[PDB]
Amino acid sequence: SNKCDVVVVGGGISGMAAAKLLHDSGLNVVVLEARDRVGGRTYTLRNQKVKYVDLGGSYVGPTQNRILRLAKELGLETYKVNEVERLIHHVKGKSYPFRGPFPPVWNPITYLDHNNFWRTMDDMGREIPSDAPWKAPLAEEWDNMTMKELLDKLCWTESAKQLATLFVNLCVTAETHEVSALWFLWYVKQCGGTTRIISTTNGGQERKFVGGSGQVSERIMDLLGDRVKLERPVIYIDQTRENVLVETLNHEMYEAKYVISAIPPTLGMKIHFNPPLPMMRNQMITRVPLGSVIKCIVYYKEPFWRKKDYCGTMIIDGEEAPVAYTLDDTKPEGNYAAIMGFILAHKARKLARLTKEERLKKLCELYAKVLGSLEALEPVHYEEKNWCEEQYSGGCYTTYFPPGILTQYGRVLRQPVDRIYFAGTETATHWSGYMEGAVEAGERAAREILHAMGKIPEDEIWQSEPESVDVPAQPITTTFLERHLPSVPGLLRLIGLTTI
């Protein structure tokens, strides 16, 4: 066997952050990575037509201070996603340009319903502890409904229900009927709430890394040298003896004091355990699927949309639209003009049947209509990745919880199993599902092992992160009217009382 202190299973950002912390603390680490590359759900493609493109995780923003600190220490820099010109909301076959993070509503009744929808998502979120969502006072009631059921109760207008549906589909690459309401409300609150999660400027989609996010995992592999073993899918973990034994598919055995599992929870099923996992984890890892998304980047000669005072952001409602959301993906130098779009949830399954050329044609026709621009029919290059086909991801962006699962099984997501500790973005408490959460979880799992070894005290396991000096976070604020305007049923109760 190859002997070390800690085997890290998985060389995504989470495993690589865990391994780096352990290596920096003076332990002997090995990373066992299934693929011929590091980065996992991040993947930066390089070729002469695109220079570089993120086909996986890409965006970082204010309050994501751990990924910003890690990337900065590795010599990386960010740039701002283009949001100079107008956003577009495309609904019922027409485009409505706007500014500010939320598409505006003019109809007074529709305005109360929209305002109440976002307000109520955050009001419910404030009842949910980030580190223990199952402790919310109505956890059971909220976990036993889908997001579809919650929207049917909350939204008194079709306008608000349709926009809320797109919000769920885009945030968690799943249908409203697929996901627990408790879990979704937790997921949004642990990113800092509705405004922070949806925003480009001042939110999650503010920035990208110059040269691609895959550099985070690659530059850590460079620091670790031959400690990263590529094409070593882990098949077996045996904790019955004094040291843990970890076996790979390519017939190698690693011996360690502790293991960090840094893979999506359900991909733990690809490992045979001796002794068997405890009942709750054994069943949990069959109950937690990942979402479905194709990330598609269409290249153009020039960022022509900016000449029409459009930034490239399109929020597109409607079953026929393949893509519900786009961002400008033009390089910071202004060249390699491109539109990034997501094909979400059922559409990632429905349109996976088409050829690459057929998907490009449908996307160009959609963009031509939404942008009112024949130039959108003149692409120069196309790249795409359907994350649903990845054996060693299971989907993207992250793991969702169907109704009933988070209250029954969520307590064991990051509960150690003897000498196995659990990393991966799914186990984070702040920007779980993101590159930020991957760093939080990898460093927390590593510190749990440092504590087990008597190297640090228990109060150093969870560590706060200083605010980025490069990416300052503007606070989330509301107006008096946003806070106190009635809901639709609130207004009807007021009318009822006046008339009585």
Ligand X SMILES: *Cc1cc2c(cc1C)nc1c(=O)[nH]c(=O)nc-1n2C[C@H](O)[C@H](O)[C@H](O)COP(=O)(O)OP(=O)(O)OC[C@H]1O[C@@H](n2cnc3c(N)ncnc32)[C@H](O)[C@@H]1O
Task: In whole angstroms, give the CA distance from residue 39 to residue 54.
Answer: 11
> Which position among 128, 315, 388, 423 is part of the footprint of a second copy (CB under 8 A)?
388
DSSP state of 100: S
Please say which residue, 152 or 309, places its beta carbon nearer to ligand C15.
152
Stretch binding ligand X (CB under 6 A), from 56-64, 125-133, 330-338, 414-422? 56-64
Of 135-164, binders to ligand C15 (CB under 6 A) are 152-153, 155-156
CA distance 341 to 296: 5
User: Do 25 and 445 contact (CB within 8 A), yes or no?
Assistant: no
413 makes contact with a second copy (CB under 8 A): no
Min separation Cβ 204 and ligand A1JC8, Å? 6
3 state SS of 327: strand
Tell me the CA distances in angstroms from 84 to 39, 252, 304, 372, 482, one per residue in order: 31, 53, 14, 19, 26
Two tokens, residue 412 = 């064991």
* Binder of residue 265, out of ligand A1JC8, ligand C15, ligand X, none (CB less than 5 to 8 A by kind): none
Output the CA–CA distances (angstroms, integers) from residue 149 to 144, 154, 241, in the order listed. 10, 9, 49
Residues within window 368-427 making contact with ligand X, judged by CB under 6 A = 387, 392-393, 396-398, 424-425
Check: CB of residue 342 under 8 Å from CB of residue 170: yes
Does position 262 bind ligand X by CB under 6 A?
Answer: yes
Q: CB 296: neighbour CB atoms within 10 A?
A: 25
- Indicate which of ligand A1JC8, ligand X, ligand C15, none lies near residue 152 (CB less than 5 to 8 Å, by partner kind): ligand C15
Tokens of 430: 């702040």
Residues numbered 348 to 367 that lie near ligand X (CB under 6 A) are none
381 binds a second copy (CB under 8 A): no
Rounded CA separation 306/330 (Å): 11
CB atoms within 10 A of CB 75: 8
Residue 490 interacts with ligand C15 (CB under 6 A): yes or no:
no
Residue 176 sits in the site that holds ligand X (CB under 6 A)? no
CB nearer to ligand C15: pick between 109 and 269: 109
CA dihedral (71, 72, 76, 82) in degrees, to 10, reads 90
Asked if 91 touches ligand A1JC8 (CB under 6 A), the answer is: no
Q: Residues 296 to 355: which contact ligand X by CB under 6 A?
A: none
What six digits make up the tokens of 180? 């627990």
Binding positions for ligand C15, rule: CB under 6 A: 152-153, 155-156, 489
Binding positions for a second copy, rule: CB under 8 A: 143-146, 148-149, 175, 177-178, 233, 235-236, 249, 251, 266-267, 269-270, 272-273, 276-280, 282-283, 286-290, 292, 346, 349, 352, 386, 388-391, 394-395, 402-405, 408-409
